[PDB]
């Protein structure tokens, strides 16, 4: 647990649940874990994270234009967000 | 151990100090002695950066390196076995102590007059330990006709 | 007549190793001028002979010429061009006007080539990685010389950094310092887009790379030529073309004597001294 | 903000026509820098753009580069190189040393290019034949600028006059002033062999021929560029390479401060003022 | 006309504090030129006004004038005079020749005044005694700037060091750094 906490706060995790963690005389086993990391800490942890990816929420596939907007958001300090529910709508 | 032959036709010396007239007299003596090479390989002057001083080899013009430090001069010229020390009385003791840390130097000539006797005795003791021959302070030096001349010994050409 | 007979000795007060005027043919660092033109070196090869006493490879001479071309002028607003224009409008002289402009070349104006070369060479030779170099410059209160543009950024490249960079990539055998500077540029553009490698930064690092990666120089020679100011010479020779152009432009336009308007000067004299 | 709204009028105090720094790309006299490199003009084409605002033909740019190459240096004994070496040995600076050397460029040193161009152009335009020109210069107590060599003569050619003359003959469309100067040289070498066309004379007349025989200039433009000192600029830019080389040479040789020997100075002070 | 009405704001790109050309009378650092001549300051007082924006005492202005007098020339052999002569013999120009000579002024030629002032001030302000200063310069491989003459020595004084030293002794209120340098 102590070491896990050091893992939690060195890689700038904000949520880290390893359940269930099965421990037997042979050792410890991480069957499952859900983790949310603080993305803005990339400039501190890019060496430790490597090429870390952040999956979108399970559902409709991301549009190429939506991924374009996400790519635009990293171009500068501006905030550039776009999300779709039904492109067949008239209110834009 | 202190050697029997101090100077030969191949003796190379380092001159401590900026004594261009003395070095030129040395070179003129070497030339009229039909030496193959000048007897002065380098000069040491702590108050300047490393450079090259223009001297005369007969009528030809040659360059002799001047080093800020003893260490660089001895590094670049391992064939030097003599130091001619033109340091004043206030610097001669330290110059000679620093010189005797290089075993390549077997003969040191100290020109300065007025060194305190206790400092000279310390120099003598270290030279005896290291087997270094010292042509004692307050001297013009000495001359080996055909081979080598110390500083201003023998006057002009 | 005593010298001809070899009867007297007189030390020469001057030394020179770049040009031999005396003799039947002019010689540029051991190379006759006819051979200079036969071998088809241009300004770059002549500069190599006169500044480094080396027969540089053809791509090195071409790169030197390109560096002179890209630094030829940068408009009339900069300090040197401004001074040259002022002196030309004073009806003065070509040499006087160009010299008045050139005397501004130094730290704040025209010295970024030398400063960038020195900074990047020091960082590269110390063995620190680009991130360590960026951090070390940051905590020393120093901006990286040769990084940063007013308008141009990643996705909006300088386009004369691009020309020189493409040439250096295609023709240089090895560009270690350029690669190091490009890693530094990746970090700095991650901080903000316009922190790109400058023309000054690219020319400085590529000139260090040319000096120590073409076969003509040892490391000591290349370092000495950087230290004594060969890149200052590159900038000065390049920008002299633009300064002379500005002089001729002011003469052709028949611009009269300039006086700075009083409304642009803040007078803060003491009450009574 | 008032200027952006166009609410106020403020006359610009400066005019310029050679370089446009502002904007996305650097522009040399209406030509983008990328186009300058794509068209493969070198130093000569950039010089044509910056000094004359013209797109010169390729042979013109090549000839300009050749002129810069042959005037790059002429040894350390001349006045400008001497002053540059003195200033470098004073531990001074690249810009300061080069400028100290350049400030000697004028009438007696480095002005023979301009003087020869002007003299030969005046003679050619007045319509007098070469013999009349030689006689007119003789009875005015004036030596012909651009004629005369210390050692070299007919059957012992300058060999950098030869290089430039061969190039000009092969590539220029017409060389009327060069032909006139060659007739003058025939007369003067009939007087004595070493009265040949100088490098200064050849460069001056060939530059006038290039200006007024390539298609880029009208006669008035070519005359104006000769008048305002473009050939002075040619010599200054060419000899700057040699002066910078001399500065670097003195720095590399670590030459100390120079003092002129007293035995070379004649002191003729008054008895008591 | 918009500036006169105070309708627009335009920051001034230049700052100056030594001379006011505009106005009825020329002003040297807050002092009218007529007052400059009435107060009978000479080159030294004008230099004090233009370089330091101060009304210096009369002995200070006299000392500045004396310093200008003693450094006026030192013959044609030095680097700057040599370059000026070369440029003059090139038929060049007064400004060009003087400038060619002046561009040699720097470290090795003409910079000993600044170097000596800085060295002695640093030693004096560090609190070390003159013997410690001499030893510290010696083991740093540095010659003391402002010490040393080619021919002149004690009992053979420079005689323009003597003139300035006598003036400074008689007219300056306190000369601590001069006393320190004399011990050195
Ligand atoms: C001396 C001479 C130039 C006077 O010129 P002028 O046209 O009468 O006046 P100036 O050119 O100095 O200035 C004109 C105006 O610009 C103003 N001005 C001067 N310098 C200025 C500056 N830096 N910024 C803004 N305005 C300025 C003046 O106050 C004057 O204002 P006004 O229009 O309200 O009178 C003219 O008589 C002349 O050419 N004489 C020949 C002899 C000579 O050249 N003497 C040398 C003078 S030492
Ligand atoms: C000041 C300092 C340079 C004195 O140097 P020096 O070596 O004693 O004397 P110089 O460098 O002037 O030259 C020595 C000899 O050259 C001679 N000489 C000087 N100028 C000459 C010239 N143009 N032509 C020929 N001979 C010349 C001198 O007469 C002198 O002759 P000597 O050998 O018969 O005595 C030295 O003490 C020093 O470096 N001090 C450091 C402080 C400093 O730099 N002060 C600046 C001086 S204002």
Residue numbers in the entry:
A (entry chain D): 185 to 276
B (entry chain A): 487 to 643
C (entry chain B), D (entry chain D): 827 to 1099
E (entry chain C): 827 to 1010
What did the paper state?
ATP citrate lyase (ACLY) is the predominant nucleocytosolic source of acetyl-CoA and is aberrantly regulated in many diseases making it an attractive therapeutic target. Structural studies of ACLY reveal a central homotetrameric core citrate synthase homology (CSH) module flanked by acyl-CoA synthetase homology (ASH) domains, with ATP and citrate binding the ASH domain and CoA binding the ASH-CSH interface to produce acetyl-CoA and oxaloacetate products. Here, we report biochemical and structural analysis of an ACLY-D1026A mutant demonstrating that this mutant traps a (3S)-citryl-CoA intermediate in the ASH domain in a configuration that is incompatible with the formation of acetyl-CoA, is able to convert acetyl-CoA and OAA to (3S)-citryl-CoA in the ASH domain, and can load CoA and unload acetyl-CoA in the CSH module.
To determine how the ACLY-D1026A mutant engages substrates, we preincubated ACLY-D1026A with substrates (citrate, CoA, and ATP) in an attempt to capture a reacted state of the mutant enzyme for cryo-EM structure determination. The cryo-EM structure (ACLY-D1026A—substrates) was determined at an overall resolution of 2.2 Å with imposing D2 symmetry. Notably, Arg 976, which plays an important role in binding non-productive, CoA changes position to avoid a steric clash with the binding of non-canonical CoA. The non-canonical CoA molecule bound to the CSH domain of the ACLY-D1026A—substrates structure sits across two subunits of the tetrameric CSH module (composed of four CSH domain subunits) such that it forms hydrophobic interactions with one CSH domain subunit and hydrogen bonds with the other CSH domain subunit, potentially locking the CSH module in a “closed” conformation that would not accommodate a translocated product from the ASH domain. In addition, a translocated product from the ASH domain would have to displace the non-canonical CoA molecule bound to the CSH domain. Interestingly, the loop containing His760 is disordered in the ACLY-D1026A—substrates structures, even though phosphate in the form of ATP was added in the ACLY-D1026A—substrates structure.
